[PDB]
Amino acid sequence: NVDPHFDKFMESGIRHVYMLFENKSVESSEQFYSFMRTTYKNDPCSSDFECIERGAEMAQSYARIMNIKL
Amino acid sequence: NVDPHFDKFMESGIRHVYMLFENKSVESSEQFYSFMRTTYKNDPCSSDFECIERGAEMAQSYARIMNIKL
Amino acid sequence: NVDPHFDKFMESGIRHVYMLFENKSVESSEQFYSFMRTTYKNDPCSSDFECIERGAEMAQSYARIMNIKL
Amino acid sequence: NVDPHFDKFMESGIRHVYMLFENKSVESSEQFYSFMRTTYKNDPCSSDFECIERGAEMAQSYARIMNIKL
């Protein structure tokens, strides 16, 4: 009751989607880490409240730069 | 030599980006699985060669539907 | 003020971690989808409440099978 | 021909697995970035060849520290 044909279809389909998305995941991982190190160095938080809070603000800014498609 | 202030900045920033991307990851995970079950049921592969090969073709089609932004 | 040497270090490091994790992401993606189709077919939810609720319960069961390391 | 009941089961199941994996994805994202900045600062690559190559070596070391389960 376990389709050995749909299974190898999905495995191959999942693997190829993984491979196809490599350049995007790498690109956006690089840029996220750069973005967060840049925005920290250009205006470092000091206290816990400001560090957590700035973390949240720059998460939103990174998102807006990712809902804009570049 | 380990910045306890940049660390909590990044942790908060990573967590909030995780939360912000929830709806996208869920949406595209749902659709991927639906897309692959739909395209299998509407034209099932039979053999290993065709199952692997159709898996690769529909991976590309899913990608094209994801580089088009809807 | 942008280290062109740490950058290519990270890009290469991110790409190779992506490649190394391929078999795990594929394996656990396959099994998640199988697990969820199996547990649905062996006891299908009917209503919205039960569908959402069973979705949550089997998410926890999948997790327990993933905190056990097999 | 589109099961509106299995769909909401999967959506809920995918969302809850996303939520459950939050602490792991955050933890391992934090540590990856720290690990890679630490290993760069404690022995920086200089040239392209060494930067790409060290990137690959520390990807493997991060992996071994992740196949060991801590």
Short mmCIF file of C-alpha atoms in Angstrom, two decimals:
data_model
loop_
_atom_site.label_atom_id
_atom_site.label_comp_id
_atom_site.label_asym_id
_atom_site.label_seq_id
_atom_site.Cartn_x
_atom_site.Cartn_y
_atom_site.Cartn_z
CA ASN A 1 0.00 0.00 0.00
CA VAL A 2 3.08 2.18 -0.50
CA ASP A 3 3.51 3.41 -4.10
CA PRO A 4 7.15 2.61 -5.00
CA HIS A 5 6.70 4.69 -8.18
CA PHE A 6 5.33 7.93 -6.75
CA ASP A 7 8.07 7.70 -4.13
CA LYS A 8 11.00 7.75 -6.54
CA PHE A 9 9.13 10.47 -8.46
CA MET A 10 9.01 12.65 -5.35
CA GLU A 11 12.59 11.91 -4.24
CA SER A 12 13.88 12.94 -7.67
CA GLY A 13 11.56 15.94 -7.70
CA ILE A 14 12.63 17.06 -4.23
CA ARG A 15 16.35 16.61 -5.03
CA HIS A 16 16.13 18.63 -8.23
CA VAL A 17 14.22 21.44 -6.53
CA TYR A 18 16.90 21.44 -3.83
CA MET A 19 19.62 21.72 -6.50
CA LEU A 20 17.72 24.40 -8.42
CA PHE A 21 17.26 26.57 -5.32
CA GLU A 22 20.95 26.38 -4.36
CA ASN A 23 21.98 29.72 -5.84
CA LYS A 24 19.03 31.51 -4.22
CA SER A 25 19.54 30.01 -0.76
CA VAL A 26 23.27 30.76 -0.89
CA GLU A 27 22.72 34.27 -2.23
CA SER A 28 20.14 35.20 0.39
CA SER A 29 22.13 33.55 3.19
CA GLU A 30 25.25 35.51 2.24
CA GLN A 31 23.31 38.76 2.01
CA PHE A 32 21.40 38.22 5.23
CA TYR A 33 24.64 37.73 7.19
CA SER A 34 26.29 40.69 5.44
CA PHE A 35 23.22 42.88 5.89
CA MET A 36 23.11 42.10 9.61
CA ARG A 37 26.83 42.63 10.18
CA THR A 38 26.76 45.86 8.17
CA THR A 39 23.73 47.31 9.97
CA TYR A 40 25.28 46.37 13.32
CA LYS A 41 28.65 47.97 12.56
CA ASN A 42 27.08 51.16 11.14
CA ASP A 43 24.99 51.66 14.33
CA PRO A 44 25.72 49.11 17.09
CA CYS A 45 23.16 48.33 19.74
CA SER A 46 24.38 48.54 23.32
CA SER A 47 21.82 47.10 25.75
CA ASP A 48 19.72 43.95 25.66
CA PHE A 49 16.51 45.87 24.92
CA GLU A 50 18.10 47.76 22.02
CA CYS A 51 19.93 44.68 20.72
CA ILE A 52 16.74 42.57 20.61
CA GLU A 53 14.77 45.55 19.26
CA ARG A 54 17.27 46.49 16.56
CA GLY A 55 17.40 42.81 15.63
CA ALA A 56 13.66 42.94 15.00
CA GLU A 57 13.77 46.21 13.04
CA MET A 58 16.52 45.04 10.71
CA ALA A 59 14.68 41.74 10.21
CA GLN A 60 11.79 43.80 8.84
CA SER A 61 14.14 45.89 6.69
CA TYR A 62 15.76 42.77 5.28
CA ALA A 63 12.27 41.47 4.53
CA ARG A 64 11.21 44.64 2.70
CA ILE A 65 14.41 44.38 0.66
CA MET A 66 13.34 40.80 -0.11
CA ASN A 67 9.72 41.59 -1.01
CA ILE A 68 11.27 44.08 -3.36
CA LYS A 69 12.78 41.54 -5.73
CA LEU A 70 16.50 42.34 -5.89
CA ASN B 1 36.71 38.02 22.47
CA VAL B 2 33.09 37.02 21.84
CA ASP B 3 30.73 40.01 21.46
CA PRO B 4 27.79 39.29 23.80
CA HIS B 5 25.94 42.24 22.22
CA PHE B 6 26.22 41.39 18.53
CA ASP B 7 25.20 37.85 19.47
CA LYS B 8 21.84 38.75 20.99
CA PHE B 9 21.36 41.15 18.06
CA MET B 10 21.80 38.30 15.59
CA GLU B 11 19.70 35.78 17.56
CA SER B 12 16.81 38.26 17.67
CA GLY B 13 17.36 39.14 14.03
CA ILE B 14 17.44 35.50 12.95
CA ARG B 15 14.33 34.63 14.99
CA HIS B 16 12.31 37.50 13.56
CA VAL B 17 13.32 36.67 10.00
CA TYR B 18 12.27 33.07 10.70
CA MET B 19 8.88 34.28 11.96
CA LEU B 20 8.45 36.70 9.05
CA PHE B 21 9.15 34.00 6.45
CA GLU B 22 6.67 31.55 8.00
CA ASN B 23 3.78 32.27 5.63
CA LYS B 24 6.04 32.01 2.57
CA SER B 25 7.70 28.75 3.61
CA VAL B 26 4.33 27.20 4.49
CA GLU B 27 2.70 28.47 1.31
CA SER B 28 5.44 27.20 -0.98
CA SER B 29 5.71 23.89 0.90
CA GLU B 30 1.97 23.30 0.56
CA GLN B 31 2.02 24.19 -3.12
CA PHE B 32 5.11 22.15 -3.90
CA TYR B 33 3.53 19.00 -2.43
CA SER B 34 0.20 19.71 -4.15
CA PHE B 35 1.90 20.53 -7.45
CA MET B 36 3.85 17.27 -7.34
CA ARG B 37 0.87 15.11 -6.37
CA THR B 38 -1.30 16.80 -9.01
CA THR B 39 1.24 16.42 -11.83
CA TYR B 40 1.78 12.78 -10.84
CA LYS B 41 -1.93 11.92 -10.79
CA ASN B 42 -2.63 13.72 -14.09
CA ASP B 43 0.14 11.74 -15.87
CA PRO B 44 1.78 9.07 -13.69
CA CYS B 45 5.27 7.83 -14.43
CA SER B 46 5.66 4.07 -14.65
CA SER B 47 9.34 3.07 -14.77
CA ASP B 48 12.36 4.21 -12.79
CA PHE B 49 13.79 6.18 -15.72
CA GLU B 50 10.51 8.00 -16.33
CA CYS B 51 9.85 8.54 -12.62
CA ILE B 52 13.27 10.12 -12.02
CA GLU B 53 13.00 12.04 -15.31
CA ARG B 54 9.48 13.34 -14.72
CA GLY B 55 10.59 14.30 -11.22
CA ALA B 56 13.27 16.49 -12.78
CA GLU B 57 10.96 18.03 -15.38
CA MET B 58 8.31 19.00 -12.85
CA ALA B 59 11.01 20.40 -10.57
CA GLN B 60 11.87 22.80 -13.40
CA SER B 61 8.20 23.60 -14.00
CA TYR B 62 7.67 24.32 -10.31
CA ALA B 63 10.73 26.58 -10.47
CA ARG B 64 9.45 28.52 -13.48
CA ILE B 65 6.16 28.99 -11.63
CA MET B 66 8.26 30.32 -8.73
CA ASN B 67 10.44 32.66 -10.80
CA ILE B 68 7.16 33.98 -12.05
CA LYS B 69 6.07 35.58 -8.79
CA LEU B 70 2.68 34.07 -7.96
CA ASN C 1 35.22 48.60 4.39
CA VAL C 2 33.84 45.36 2.95
CA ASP C 3 36.22 42.39 3.34
CA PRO C 4 36.44 40.79 -0.13
CA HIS C 5 38.28 37.85 1.45
CA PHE C 6 35.92 36.93 4.28
CA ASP C 7 33.10 37.20 1.74
CA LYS C 8 34.37 34.54 -0.64
CA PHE C 9 35.22 32.45 2.44
CA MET C 10 31.60 32.60 3.59
CA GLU C 11 30.09 32.06 0.13
CA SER C 12 32.20 28.91 -0.31
CA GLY C 13 31.42 27.84 3.24
CA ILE C 14 27.69 28.38 2.81
CA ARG C 15 27.62 26.55 -0.55
CA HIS C 16 29.46 23.53 0.80
CA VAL C 17 27.21 23.30 3.85
CA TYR C 18 24.23 23.49 1.48
CA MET C 19 25.67 20.62 -0.59
CA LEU C 20 26.54 18.58 2.50
CA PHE C 21 23.02 18.88 3.93
CA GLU C 22 21.36 17.81 0.67
CA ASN C 23 20.80 14.18 1.61
CA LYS C 24 19.36 15.13 5.01
CA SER C 25 16.98 17.78 3.67
CA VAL C 26 15.79 15.45 0.90
CA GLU C 27 15.44 12.50 3.26
CA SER C 28 13.45 14.41 5.86
CA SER C 29 11.33 16.15 3.21
CA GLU C 30 10.43 12.80 1.62
CA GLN C 31 9.62 11.27 4.99
CA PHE C 32 7.62 14.24 6.23
CA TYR C 33 5.35 14.12 3.16
CA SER C 34 5.05 10.32 3.37
CA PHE C 35 4.44 10.42 7.12
CA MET C 36 1.67 12.99 6.68
CA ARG C 37 -0.01 11.19 3.78
CA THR C 38 0.23 7.87 5.61
CA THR C 39 -1.21 9.18 8.89
CA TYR C 40 -4.01 10.91 6.97
CA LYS C 41 -4.97 7.80 4.98
CA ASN C 42 -4.84 5.52 8.04
CA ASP C 43 -7.24 7.81 9.97
CA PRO C 44 -8.59 10.74 7.92
CA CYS C 45 -9.82 13.88 9.59
CA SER C 46 -13.27 15.05 8.55
CA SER C 47 -14.01 18.55 9.88
CA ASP C 48 -11.95 21.71 10.01
CA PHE C 49 -11.38 21.44 13.77
CA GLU C 50 -10.21 17.83 13.51
CA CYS C 51 -8.14 18.49 10.38
CA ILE C 52 -6.26 21.41 11.98
CA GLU C 53 -5.99 19.49 15.26
CA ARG C 54 -4.77 16.24 13.73
CA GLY C 55 -2.31 18.30 11.70
CA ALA C 56 -0.88 19.61 14.96
CA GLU C 57 -0.76 16.20 16.66
CA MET C 58 1.06 14.53 13.79
CA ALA C 59 3.48 17.47 13.62
CA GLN C 60 4.43 16.62 17.21
CA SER C 61 4.68 12.91 16.39
CA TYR C 62 6.91 13.63 13.41
CA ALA C 63 9.05 15.78 15.72
CA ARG C 64 9.39 13.05 18.34
CA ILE C 65 10.44 10.68 15.56
CA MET C 66 13.02 13.32 14.60
CA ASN C 67 14.34 13.95 18.12
CA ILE C 68 14.79 10.23 18.20
CA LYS C 69 17.59 10.08 15.65
CA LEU C 70 16.40 7.70 12.92
CA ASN D 1 -10.83 16.39 -7.44
CA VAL D 2 -8.91 18.44 -4.87
CA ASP D 3 -9.37 17.21 -1.28
CA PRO D 4 -10.27 20.32 0.76
CA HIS D 5 -9.82 18.24 3.93
CA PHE D 6 -6.37 16.76 3.37
CA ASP D 7 -5.27 20.26 2.34
CA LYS D 8 -6.11 21.97 5.61
CA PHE D 9 -4.61 18.94 7.38
CA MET D 10 -1.31 19.47 5.59
CA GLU D 11 -1.28 23.26 5.98
CA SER D 12 -1.79 22.90 9.73
CA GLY D 13 0.76 20.10 9.85
CA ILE D 14 3.34 22.08 7.90
CA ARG D 15 2.81 25.22 10.01
CA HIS D 16 3.20 23.36 13.29
CA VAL D 17 6.36 21.60 12.11
CA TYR D 18 7.69 25.01 11.08
CA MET D 19 6.93 26.39 14.55
CA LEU D 20 8.39 23.33 16.29
CA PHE D 21 11.67 23.56 14.36
CA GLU D 22 12.12 27.27 15.12
CA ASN D 23 14.54 26.85 18.02
CA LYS D 24 16.68 24.37 16.07
CA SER D 25 16.88 26.47 12.91
CA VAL D 26 17.71 29.60 14.92
CA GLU D 27 20.24 27.77 17.08
CA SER D 28 22.07 26.20 14.16
CA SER D 29 21.94 29.42 12.12
CA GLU D 30 23.45 31.40 15.00
CA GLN D 31 26.15 28.80 15.54
CA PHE D 32 26.97 28.41 11.87
CA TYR D 33 27.58 32.16 11.50
CA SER D 34 29.56 32.29 14.76
CA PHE D 35 31.55 29.17 13.86
CA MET D 36 32.47 30.65 10.48
CA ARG D 37 33.41 34.07 11.84
CA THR D 38 35.42 32.49 14.65
CA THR D 39 37.34 30.09 12.39
CA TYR D 40 38.05 32.96 9.98
CA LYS D 41 39.35 35.32 12.67
CA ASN D 42 41.49 32.62 14.33
CA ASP D 43 43.22 31.81 10.99
CA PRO D 44 42.18 34.10 8.11
CA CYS D 45 42.50 32.97 4.53
CA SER D 46 44.33 35.35 2.21
CA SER D 47 43.95 34.30 -1.44
CA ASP D 48 40.97 33.13 -3.46
CA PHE D 49 42.18 29.52 -3.54
CA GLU D 50 42.70 29.42 0.23
CA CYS D 51 39.47 31.31 0.95
CA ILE D 52 37.35 28.91 -1.14
CA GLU D 53 39.32 25.93 0.21
CA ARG D 54 39.12 26.94 3.86
CA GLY D 55 35.42 27.60 3.32
CA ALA D 56 35.05 23.98 2.24
CA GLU D 57 37.13 22.57 5.10
CA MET D 58 35.21 24.44 7.78
CA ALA D 59 31.93 23.40 6.16
CA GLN D 60 33.01 19.80 6.78
CA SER D 61 34.08 20.61 10.34
CA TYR D 62 30.75 22.29 11.05
CA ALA D 63 29.06 19.18 9.65
CA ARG D 64 31.04 16.80 11.86
CA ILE D 65 30.09 18.97 14.84
CA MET D 66 26.49 18.58 13.66
CA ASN D 67 26.60 14.81 13.11
CA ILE D 68 27.89 14.73 16.63
CA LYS D 69 24.66 15.81 18.30
CA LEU D 70 25.52 18.90 20.35
#
